[PDB]
Amino acid sequence: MVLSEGEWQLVLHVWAKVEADVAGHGQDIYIRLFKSHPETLEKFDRFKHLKTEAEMKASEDLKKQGVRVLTALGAILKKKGHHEAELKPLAQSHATKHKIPIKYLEFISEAIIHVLHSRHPGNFGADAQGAMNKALELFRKDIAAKYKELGYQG
Ligand code: HEM
Ligand SMILES: [O-]
Hints:
Elements (H helix, E strand, L loop, with lengths): L4 H14 L3 H15 L16 H6 L1 H19 L5 H14 L4 H18 L6 H25 L4
The structure holds protoporphyrin IX containing FE and hydroxide ion.
């Protein structure tokens, strides 16, 4: 599975807009994920008690977590497929420490696409969304292969 350079440029052009305010984007993505698929919130021991969107928005720890996730994902995207080193620690923690199935990675990918589609119509038209979907599918395909190497079904 391989993206073209043009596809990577569409991914990186919208990611540059995320980077104007990574914290705010992270909050929107987590709120979308937890509202759409409430079961995913149960995996977060520090945040599973949050009851409403207002509580999620006011959580400084959730905001910091969103920054960590999007910055890690941004570093992966900037490797344009050459992300073996970045995926090692992430696959190990998500398979063995956090126990995050591939289906939940699909759910957060959907939340990312939903938020970019809402916030960034200037850089998230159909071709750009297609490229981002391809990049996230590549990420999940490579994470799933590493999960299997690590002993986790996913
Ligand atoms: C785009 C996909 C994702 C990325 C890039 C990502 C990235 C990260 C990073 C960088 C950390 C901190 C270091 C670590 O423990 O590895 C983290 C922690 C964590 N991740 Fe993810 N993650 C992703 C998806 C998910 C999903 C979908 C879930 C659950 C449904 C999840 C559950 C967790 C939990 C529970 C923690 C620990 C949080 C805490 O310290 O309170 N991750 N993630
Ligand atoms: O995460």
